[PDB]
Ligand binder design. Structure first.
Ligand code: W4P
Ligand code: ZN
Length: 299
């Protein structure tokens, strides 16, 4: 059987919210079978619980925000990507503030935190959502699509408005084996252009941002002293974001995602459209892991 997974132990991290600039304490707690990823705001009385599900998304401007009443959890995409990548089904994420800490701007520190706490396989079949039919959404020149594929694959194209490393676009495609996410995606940091960042800062946004958690591109040159972790780090980061948004389906996907200048807003539109189109998907489990189209690393 491909089994559900949780953490073996509680683990803690601290960081700053990139948007809010607030110091936040993060606790990952093990959870039992069929819990899913549940976020909680520990700083509120009573404590408020928000399942990490498409129906709980309230804002998608520059990050995915979960909302329940007037209670928000901002920037869930990078932590959710790490959980998707490692195959964590069940976890409580307890936050002392309205934003997940940015860490280094990738999923790398979250996958390390999770793999340090250890993975616990549970005595229940892991649930997958299979893409049975193509589903697509467009808005102007932007496109996001689910395509049937016996496995998990994510393609992305981004269009910069000017030349960066002497071209206007980057494309990447990752056909996932057990090991692809940690090695080729997890370390891809978020990025901003200096002129955009200057504008975001003027409007009192990106208050936690720095070279320590973001690639800063001034014109066509990277300002970060040590440069890039991958040649195509920027498009690999959009693949990271997309895997985090896809996990709001609450079950691991069997199929292909393609993004063309997509972002959190259109990614979330795709998810809502797929969820509505019940003939395009079906929940499945694998009692024989050897015949399953997706493998996870050993726990
Ligand atoms: C959760 S992140 C999101 C994409 N996203 N959205 N907003 C963002 C803001 C930034 C930033 C930044 C920043 C970097 C350095 C500095 C210091 N500074 C300024 C000028 N000169 C200096 C050097 O002294 C100031 C701000 C990066 C990515 C962003 N994402 O990936 C969603 O998925
Ligand atoms: Zn991101």
């Amino acid at each position: 059987m491909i089994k559900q997974r949780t953490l073996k132990n509680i683990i803690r991290a601290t960081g700053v919210g990139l948007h809010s600039g607030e110091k936040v304490y993060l606790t990952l707690k093990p959870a039992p079978v069929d819990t899913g990823i549940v976020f909680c705001r520990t700083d509120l009385d009573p404590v408020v619980e928000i399942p990490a599900r498409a129906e709980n998304v309230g804002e998608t401007t520059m990050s995915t925000t979960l909302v329940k009443g007037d209670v928000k959890v901002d920037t869930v995409e990078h932590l959710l990507s790490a959980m998707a990548g490692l195959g964590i089904d069940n976890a409580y994420v307890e936050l002392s503030a309205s934003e997940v800490p940015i860490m280094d701007g990738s999923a790398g520190p979250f996958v390390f935190l999770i793999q340090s706490a250890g993975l616990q396989e549970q005595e229940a079949a892991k649930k997958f959502i299979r893409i049975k039919r193509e589903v697509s959404v467009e808005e102007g020149d932007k496109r996001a699509v689910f395509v049937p594929f016996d496995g998990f694959k994510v393609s992305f194209e981004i269009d910069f408005d000017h030349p960066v490393f002497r071209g206007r676009t980057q494309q990447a495609s990752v056909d996932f084996s057990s090991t692809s996410f940690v090695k080729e995606v997890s370390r891809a940091r978020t990025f901003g252009f200096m002129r955009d960042i200057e504008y975001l800062r003027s409007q009192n946004l990106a208050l936690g941002g720095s070279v320590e958690n973001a690639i800063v591109v001034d014109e066509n040159r990277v300002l970060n002293e040590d440069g890039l972790r991958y040649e195509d780090e920027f498009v690999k980061h959009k693949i990271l974001d997309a895997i985090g948004d896809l996990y709001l389906l609450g079950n691991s996907l069997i199929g292909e995602f393609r993004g063309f200048k997509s972002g959190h807003a259109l990614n979330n539109q795709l998810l809502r459209t797929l969820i509505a189109d019940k003939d395009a998907w079906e929940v499945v489990t694998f009692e024989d892991a050897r015949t399953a189209p997706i493998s996870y690393m050993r726990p």
